[PDB]
Scaffold this active site. Structure first.
Site, mmCIF file in Angstrom:
data_model
loop_
_atom_site.group_PDB
_atom_site.id
_atom_site.type_symbol
_atom_site.label_atom_id
_atom_site.label_comp_id
_atom_site.label_asym_id
_atom_site.label_seq_id
_atom_site.Cartn_x
_atom_site.Cartn_y
_atom_site.Cartn_z
ATOM 1 N N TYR A 130 0.858 -1.161 0.000
ATOM 2 C CA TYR A 130 0.000 0.000 0.000
ATOM 3 C C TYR A 130 0.900 1.217 0.000
ATOM 4 O O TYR A 130 1.194 1.779 1.047
ATOM 5 C CB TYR A 130 -0.960 0.013 1.204
ATOM 6 C CG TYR A 130 -2.218 0.839 0.991
ATOM 7 C CD1 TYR A 130 -3.476 0.242 1.017
ATOM 8 C CD2 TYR A 130 -2.157 2.222 0.826
ATOM 9 C CE1 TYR A 130 -4.639 0.988 0.839
ATOM 10 C CE2 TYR A 130 -3.321 2.984 0.640
ATOM 11 C CZ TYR A 130 -4.562 2.359 0.687
ATOM 12 O OH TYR A 130 -5.740 3.042 0.514
ATOM 13 N N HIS A 178 -4.269 -0.422 -2.487
ATOM 14 C CA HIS A 178 -5.442 0.460 -2.481
ATOM 15 C C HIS A 178 -6.643 -0.150 -3.207
ATOM 16 O O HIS A 178 -7.703 0.471 -3.207
ATOM 17 C CB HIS A 178 -5.076 1.832 -3.080
ATOM 18 C CG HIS A 178 -4.585 1.737 -4.503
ATOM 19 N ND1 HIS A 178 -3.331 1.225 -4.806
ATOM 20 C CD2 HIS A 178 -5.211 2.069 -5.653
ATOM 21 C CE1 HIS A 178 -3.236 1.261 -6.127
ATOM 22 N NE2 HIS A 178 -4.332 1.788 -6.679
ATOM 23 N N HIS A 182 -13.238 -3.664 1.680
ATOM 24 C CA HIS A 182 -13.585 -3.938 3.078
ATOM 25 C C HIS A 182 -14.440 -5.186 3.220
ATOM 26 O O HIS A 182 -15.351 -5.394 2.432
ATOM 27 C CB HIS A 182 -14.378 -2.743 3.675
ATOM 28 C CG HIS A 182 -15.031 -3.078 4.986
ATOM 29 N ND1 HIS A 182 -14.299 -3.082 6.166
ATOM 30 C CD2 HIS A 182 -16.277 -3.561 5.234
ATOM 31 C CE1 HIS A 182 -15.135 -3.505 7.106
ATOM 32 N NE2 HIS A 182 -16.346 -3.804 6.588
ATOM 33 N N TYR A 190 -3.795 -5.051 7.194
ATOM 34 C CA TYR A 190 -2.751 -4.104 6.796
ATOM 35 C C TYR A 190 -1.637 -4.293 7.832
ATOM 36 O O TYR A 190 -1.937 -4.482 9.020
ATOM 37 C CB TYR A 190 -3.230 -2.638 6.856
ATOM 38 C CG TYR A 190 -4.324 -2.344 5.863
ATOM 39 C CD1 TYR A 190 -4.091 -2.427 4.491
ATOM 40 C CD2 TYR A 190 -5.588 -1.951 6.289
ATOM 41 C CE1 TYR A 190 -5.093 -2.127 3.570
ATOM 42 C CE2 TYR A 190 -6.595 -1.649 5.380
ATOM 43 C CZ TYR A 190 -6.347 -1.747 4.023
ATOM 44 O OH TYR A 190 -7.367 -1.491 3.137
ATOM 45 N N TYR A 220 -11.736 -2.469 7.404
ATOM 46 C CA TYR A 220 -11.324 -1.053 7.421
ATOM 47 C C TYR A 220 -11.383 -0.487 8.844
ATOM 48 O O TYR A 220 -12.147 -0.988 9.674
ATOM 49 C CB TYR A 220 -12.192 -0.183 6.490
ATOM 50 C CG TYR A 220 -11.898 -0.318 5.009
ATOM 51 C CD1 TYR A 220 -11.188 -1.413 4.509
ATOM 52 C CD2 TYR A 220 -12.400 0.603 4.094
ATOM 53 C CE1 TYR A 220 -10.941 -1.554 3.145
ATOM 54 C CE2 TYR A 220 -12.209 0.435 2.720
ATOM 55 C CZ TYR A 220 -11.454 -0.623 2.257
ATOM 56 O OH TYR A 220 -11.313 -0.811 0.905
HETATM 57 N N1 LIG Z 1 -11.035 8.509 11.164
HETATM 58 C C1 LIG Z 1 -10.897 8.167 10.088
HETATM 59 C C2 LIG Z 1 -10.717 7.724 8.741
HETATM 60 C C3 LIG Z 1 -10.565 8.653 7.714
HETATM 61 C C4 LIG Z 1 -10.368 8.218 6.407
HETATM 62 C C5 LIG Z 1 -10.383 6.848 6.129
HETATM 63 C C6 LIG Z 1 -10.548 5.914 7.159
HETATM 64 C C7 LIG Z 1 -10.498 4.404 6.866
HETATM 65 C C8 LIG Z 1 -9.049 3.903 7.024
HETATM 66 N N2 LIG Z 1 -8.787 3.819 8.475
HETATM 67 S S1 LIG Z 1 -7.316 4.356 9.076
HETATM 68 O O1 LIG Z 1 -6.211 3.958 8.138
HETATM 69 O O2 LIG Z 1 -7.119 3.722 10.428
HETATM 70 C C9 LIG Z 1 -7.303 6.120 9.271
HETATM 71 C C10 LIG Z 1 -7.086 6.917 8.150
HETATM 72 C C11 LIG Z 1 -7.147 8.298 8.250
HETATM 73 C C12 LIG Z 1 -7.279 8.906 9.490
HETATM 74 C C13 LIG Z 1 -7.439 8.117 10.635
HETATM 75 C C14 LIG Z 1 -7.438 6.721 10.522
HETATM 76 C C15 LIG Z 1 -7.632 8.762 12.025
HETATM 77 C C16 LIG Z 1 -8.044 10.232 11.853
HETATM 78 N N3 LIG Z 1 -7.098 10.904 10.935
HETATM 79 C C17 LIG Z 1 -7.271 10.438 9.535
HETATM 80 C C18 LIG Z 1 -8.914 2.511 6.379
HETATM 81 O O3 LIG Z 1 -8.917 1.496 7.082
HETATM 82 N N4 LIG Z 1 -8.742 2.397 5.059
HETATM 83 C C19 LIG Z 1 -8.591 1.114 4.347
HETATM 84 C C20 LIG Z 1 -8.367 1.477 2.862
HETATM 85 C C21 LIG Z 1 -8.189 2.999 2.819
HETATM 86 C C22 LIG Z 1 -8.733 3.542 4.129
HETATM 87 C C23 LIG Z 1 -10.676 6.354 8.470
HETATM 88 C C1 LIG Z 2 -9.219 1.439 -0.828
HETATM 89 S S1 LIG Z 2 -10.510 1.638 -2.145
HETATM 90 C C2 LIG Z 2 -10.743 -0.156 -2.530
HETATM 91 C C3 LIG Z 2 -10.833 -0.289 -4.103
HETATM 92 C C4 LIG Z 2 -12.019 0.478 -4.786
HETATM 93 N N1 LIG Z 2 -13.114 -0.461 -4.706
HETATM 94 C C5 LIG Z 2 -11.652 0.753 -6.237
HETATM 95 O O1 LIG Z 2 -12.409 0.367 -7.115
HETATM 96 O O2 LIG Z 2 -10.593 1.383 -6.553
HETATM 97 C C6 LIG Z 2 -11.862 2.072 -1.029
HETATM 98 C C7 LIG Z 2 -13.164 2.309 -1.761
HETATM 99 O O3 LIG Z 2 -13.773 1.042 -2.175
HETATM 100 C C8 LIG Z 2 -15.178 1.028 -1.979
HETATM 101 N N2 LIG Z 2 -15.434 -0.102 -1.059
HETATM 102 C C9 LIG Z 2 -14.521 -0.811 -0.272
HETATM 103 N N3 LIG Z 2 -15.131 -1.786 0.379
HETATM 104 C C10 LIG Z 2 -16.458 -1.766 0.057
HETATM 105 C C11 LIG Z 2 -17.562 -2.541 0.447
HETATM 106 N N4 LIG Z 2 -17.373 -3.645 1.353
HETATM 107 N N5 LIG Z 2 -18.812 -2.174 -0.099
HETATM 108 C C12 LIG Z 2 -18.950 -1.119 -0.910
HETATM 109 N N6 LIG Z 2 -17.927 -0.385 -1.337
HETATM 110 C C13 LIG Z 2 -16.679 -0.671 -0.859
HETATM 111 C C14 LIG Z 2 -15.569 2.422 -1.414
HETATM 112 O O4 LIG Z 2 -15.821 3.226 -2.562
HETATM 113 C C15 LIG Z 2 -14.248 2.892 -0.797
HETATM 114 O O5 LIG Z 2 -14.176 4.324 -0.804
#
Ligand SMILES: N#Cc1cccc(C[C@@H](NS(=O)(=O)c2ccc3c(c2)CCNC3)C(=O)N2CCCC2)c1
Ligand SMILES: C[S@@+](CC[C@H](N)C(=O)[O-])C[C@H]1O[C@@H](n2cnc3c(N)ncnc32)[C@H](O)[C@@H]1O
Length: 246
Positions: A130, A178, A182, A190, A220
């Protein structure tokens, strides 16, 4: 001659003969991926990859590695992102990840693209990286929350983001972490990763044995208070189907 193997907590390693200052500097240094086979061999300066050629670790004799260069002239270098520059060769795929995962339509209804296993692997396997631009938590929090689909926390200070247009494989495919969607029943997590090209990032690591062509999913990190609407809907739908003791 002496050889030093520096293993990172993620399983990858830096291997080579150190110089007179105890530095990983020379023309025959290598980064070896967690499979202990895929390697980037060549010029390193103080452990930093200047020119790493794609190679295979064939054997080791008393700690001395034997590498064979892979045909095809795949070459890499240290290319850590900034807040605005994701990569200087956005379309050059990671060789280790290329053999383990692919992108296709998600099996999750309306979830866009998903990340899939190309091979059968056991538990605790690094599958994908990532990588992205490096921004602060304050920037993510303060800006328009609709720009935060791909913002993954690295540590208390930094967030890794894959912003538009790099969230499309036609613009960026150096890493594919990316693309994992979820799930509340994920098969990956991760985890921290120290990459010779991307620097300090996160990786996708399996939680269990995964079969070829399974979708790779991660739970997530929300909280939840102000989680995206698709997450809130999925939470309720997931809860409604859980079997209960009567
Ligand atoms: N809070 C929050 C927050 C904000 C943006 C996105 C997320 C989800 C994000 N959770 S996270 O990485 O723990 C995260 C990311 C951004 C921020 C936080 C945590 C804490 C608040 N500051 C911003 C996640 O699991 N993702 C998986 C694929 C991409 C994102 C959480
Ligand atoms: C880290 S990207 C994962 C890849 C994304 N699906 C793409 O096409 O590029 C995160 C985005 O995927 C979508 N997503 C991830 N998990 C999902 C789920 N379980 N159901 C619906 N949308 C989801 C949401 O749009 C989210 O903002």
């Amino acid at each position: 001659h002496g050889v030093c193997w520096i293993y990172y907590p993620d399983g990858g390693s830096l291997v080579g003969e150190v110089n007179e200052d105890g530095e990983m500097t020379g023309e025959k240094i290598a980064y070896v991926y967690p499979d202990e086979r895929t390697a980037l061999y060549g010029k390193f300066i103080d452990g930093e990859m200047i020119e790493g050629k794609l190679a295979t670790l064939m054997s080791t004799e008393e700690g001395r590695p034997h590498f064979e260069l892979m045909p095809g002239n795949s070459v890499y270098h240290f290319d850590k992102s900034t807040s605005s520059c994701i990569s200087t060769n956005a379309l050059l795929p990671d060789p280790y990840e290329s053999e383990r995962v692919y992108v296709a339509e998600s099996l999750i209804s309306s979830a866009g693209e998903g990340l899939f296993s190309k091979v059968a692997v056991g538990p605790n396997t690094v599958m994908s990286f990532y990588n992205g631009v490096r921004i602060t938590h304050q920037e993510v929090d303060s800006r328009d929350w609709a720009l935060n689909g791909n913002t993954l926390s690295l540590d208390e200070e930094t967030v890794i983001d894959v912003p538009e247009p790099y969230n499309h494989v036609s613009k960026y495919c150096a890493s594919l972490g990316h693309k994992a969607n979820h799930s509340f029943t994920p098969n990956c997590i991760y985890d921290m990763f120290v990459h010779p090209r991307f620097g300090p990032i996160k990786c996708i690591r399996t939680l269990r044995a995964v079969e070829a062509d399974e979708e790779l999913t991660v739970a997530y990190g929300y909280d939840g208070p102000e989680a995206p609407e698709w997450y809130q809907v999925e939470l309720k739908a997931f809860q409604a189907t859980q079997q209960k003791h009567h």
